[PDB]
Write a protein that binds this DNA or RNA. Structure first.
Ligand SMILES: [Mg+2]
Ligand SMILES: [Mg+2]
Ligand SMILES: [Mg+2]
Lengths: 76, 177, 136, 116, 50
RNA sequence: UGCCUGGCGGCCGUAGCGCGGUGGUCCCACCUGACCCCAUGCCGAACUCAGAAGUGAAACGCCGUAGCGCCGAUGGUAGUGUGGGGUCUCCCCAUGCGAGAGUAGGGAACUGCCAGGCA
RNA sequence: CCUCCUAAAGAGUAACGGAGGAGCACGAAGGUUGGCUAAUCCUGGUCGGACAUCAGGAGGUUAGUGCAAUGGCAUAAGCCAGCUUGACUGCGAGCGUGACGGCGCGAGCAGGUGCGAAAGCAGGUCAUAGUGAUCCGGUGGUUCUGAAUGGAAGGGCCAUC
RNA sequence: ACUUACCAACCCGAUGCAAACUGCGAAUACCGGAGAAUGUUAUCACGGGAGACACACGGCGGGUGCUAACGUCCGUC
């Protein structure tokens, strides 16, 4: 019934994959909820956007007793 | 604490030999008696809510919390977080003194009284009951009444079965069924 | 007529009919009717083929329907241009793969099973064959 | 449950100090005794540990756990910490209130000269 | 619309003001907030919420 | 060094649940008392104080048990990149990678620092 | 303008394709500190039934989140109380996303505060919609300009309608 | 206080289906790093001048249409 609307697709997804050396302040994954969680040297933004807090490589880990995914940054 | 001393002297040694426990701490014991009053009618008029508070605080000896409602549904005509009842939980010295005043003056002066029900257990060893026509309570005067009110006397017991809950009241002598 | 009583959404895309079937063995009765070809079974075809066998296998035994349509097909009516949104739902179809057991029957002789399944194979738009329950 | 409600209460304060990489001072309270441990930021090893179940502390105490005992063992951990020099540890209340022996163990260690 | 605009005026000598919105229909009470005045470089009393 | 117990972790169900048995010198748990420090959106239940009369019940720790959760091959099947072909709505052939589910089976965790008790 | 799918396991991706929703609300529904754990069902029972409120047990987030939908949420972002105003100002490395105009995230520093004992946290709200570029003026502040000079008018700057 | 040739929720076992179901899970594609070979820099930045913004069909992955169209709208070649 009277359909036919669609919004601008927000540019989500992973912007910095694992093994990439990023700068301090770079955006790794743009996301709505906590699909990915903050870990070592990774800050969580206001809109749950995970960013870098230190210069290093992106490391994906699955830790915790609830089997949740994490993003950590090891020193290069 | 007349029945608290009566508990340690008579009730503990009675259940020690009846159900042959290996530890003396395996005895059933009372934890709390939650004096409740679900007034309910306070959607229309709020003056019966304040009167219910003072009547439940006359049966007990301390101030209650006006209880907020559980979950807002439309078919039951209640709102989320709505003041609709009041309760008092008694633990310690207030618990033993009220339990004596319950069984010897309030319970026998019930008209048409034949006995409580010996099967009014929850399934794990706790007993809930009510007593009718609250004039039987000596605190409420007959001139200060507004309407018949409510009360849910529940005996919280650390026992693991209903049979252990039966024998604990037997030492409190619970007049009979 | 076999159709869903309630769906979360009214319309559904066209899709494809690729892949192999999963309804391989008879697990309710002893006799079955297995599809050989590939295609779609509409709501009228499933209803008519149930009526086609039931006439000859009179009221004893038991018949199962192993499939369910769960897929609507819309049509655009005559003298209507293309566009103007998707058309209205007309009939329900079922995606059928080669190897799907469609029709089952139990409590009948084997000779009676050969007759009724032959009478129901003509109403189906795809080729079928006769199968029998194998254990394990 | 009694114990598991204490664990989930502290868990927000536990993992917050893990995100900062600081050394935390956890406490365990008992009607009998009381515990206090200085833990490395990895969490798998400790550096300063002194309790009231040790006979060195319980001799000077009338009862094993009270506000006087938490002042004794609060100093005792803090005196062993200054001999090691961990010097600005963090304080983990570990699910208890900051009102009683948890406060008494903390204020005694503040008096010795630790930075928290 | 229904939502009106107000200006939080500093109680000090400076005439610096912030802006915000309040509901005049159900909340006629004057707002009381402490905000940073960048002229006097302190936190001061803000008043006059219409 | 062994045994037992506590604390914080690594790990995140081969670490869970249920059933059966067992532990109190120490430990922990309940328990005792509470005018008070305080606490309750009522309530010494929780919170928290002061004590040790009592006890291994509830809970917790350990051992045992395959009812359940979970882990999980080998082979095979579905699918697919590239190329080729057919009866071209679909499928096959050459080569590369390999499921899901299910079966055999595994499985009643393992490990680090430190403290206490016993020998 | 927002949400999901179409979208073919990165992003992007059309149609008079399929389903909705927004032109706000909020001084607490914000910040911080301290606490708290539902949905459903069994049994028990002065008024009391289908529900008024409870007790224990089963169950362990299927509940809830100012609303559309998805992705989140137990350390709870859910709920309650105390104290409050960081819904701070001047800045901002670095980054996402755009043809462009622009939009969005962002630690940290300087100044002065709120809460907590403290480590710390706070530049709005679980996130993603709640919006109108410019010209033209209105209001407040700032000697910046002042068509001979000294003012003033007007304009600009900043705040705002 | 019980039951009958009655209707029947939840739960349990067996069995399917779903672009807007996922307790599971590829092929390749994509992102980053290292390495050899090969390719007239094929790449990026910047400057001068454009044209083009009506695309077609075929294979494949689809929406729509009748798994009609030398039909239409995308992705890819
Ligand atoms: Mg206690
Ligand atoms: Mg036991
Ligand atoms: Mg497998």
């Amino acid at each position: 019934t009277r359909n036919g609307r669609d919004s601008e697709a927000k540019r989500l997804g992973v912007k910095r994959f694992g093994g990439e050396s990023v700068l301090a302040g770079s955006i790794i994954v743009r996301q709505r909820g906590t699909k990915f969680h903050a870990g070592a040297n990774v800050g969580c933004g206001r809109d749950h956007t995970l960013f870098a807090k230190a210069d290093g490589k992106v490391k994906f880990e699955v830790k915790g007793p609830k089997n949740r995914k994490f993003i950590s940054i090891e020193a290069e | 604490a007349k029945l608290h001393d009566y508990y340690k002297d008579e009730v503990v040694k009675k259940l020690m030999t009846e159900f042959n426990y290996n530890s003396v701490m395996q005895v059933p014991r009372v934890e709390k008696i939650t004096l409740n009053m679900g007034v309910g009618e306070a959607i229309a008029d709020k003056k019966l809510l304040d009167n219910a508070a003072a009547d439940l605080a006359a049966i007990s000896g301390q101030k209650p919390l006006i209880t907020k409602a559980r979950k807002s549904v439309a078919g039951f005509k209640i709102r989320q977080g709505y003041p609709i009842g009041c309760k008092v939980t008694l633990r310690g010295e207030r618990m033993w003194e009220f339990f004596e005043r319950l069984i010897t003056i309030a319970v026998p002066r019930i008209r048409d009284f034949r006995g409580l029900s010996a099967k009014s257990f929850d399934g794990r060893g706790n007993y809930s009951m009510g007593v009718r026509e609250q004039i039987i309570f000596p605190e409420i005067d007959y001139d200060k009444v507004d309407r018949v009110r409510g009360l849910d006397i529940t005996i919280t017991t650390t026992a693991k079965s209903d049979e252990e809950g039966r024998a604990l009241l037997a030492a409190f002598d619970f007049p009979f069924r | 007529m076999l159709q869903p009583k309630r769906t979360k959404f009214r319309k559904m895309h066209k899709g494809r009919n690729r892949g192999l079937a999963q309804g391989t063995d008879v697990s309710f009765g002893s006799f079955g009717l297995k599809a050989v070809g590939r295609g779609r079974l509409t709501a009228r075809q499933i209803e008519a083929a149930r009526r086609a066998m039931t006439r000859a296998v009179k009221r004893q035994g038991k018949i199962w329907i192993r499939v369910f349509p769960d897929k609507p097909i819309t049509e655009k009516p005559l003298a209507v241009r293309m566009g103007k949104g998707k058309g209205n739902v007309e009939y329900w179809v079922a995606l059928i793969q080669p190897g799907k057991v469609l029709y089952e029957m139990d409590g009948v002789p084997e000779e009676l099973a050969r007759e009724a399944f032959k009478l129901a194979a003509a109403k189906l738009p795809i080729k079928t064959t006769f199968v029998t329950k194998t254990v394990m | 449950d009694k114990k598991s409600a204490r664990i989930r209460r502290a868990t927000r304060a536990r993992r917050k100090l893990q995100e900062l990489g600081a050394t935390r001072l956890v406490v365990h309270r008992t009607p009998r005794h009381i515990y206090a441990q200085v833990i490395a930021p990895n969490g798998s090893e400790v550096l300063v540990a002194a309790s009231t179940v040790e006979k060195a502390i319980a001799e000077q105490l009338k009862y094993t756990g009270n506000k006087d005992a938490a002042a004794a063992v609060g100093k005792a951990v803090a005196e062993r910490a200054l001999e090691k020099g961990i010097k600005d540890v963090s304080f983990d209340r570990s699910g208890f209130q900051y009102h009683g022996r948890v406060q008494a163990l903390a204020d005694a260690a503040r008096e010795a000269g630790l930075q928290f | 619309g229904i939502r009106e605009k107000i200006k939080l005026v500093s109680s000090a000598g400076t005439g610096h003001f912030y802006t915000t919105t309040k509901n005049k229909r159900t909340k006629p009470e004057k707002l009381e907030l402490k905000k940073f005045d960048p002229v006097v470089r302190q936190h001061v009393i803000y008043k006059e919420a219409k």
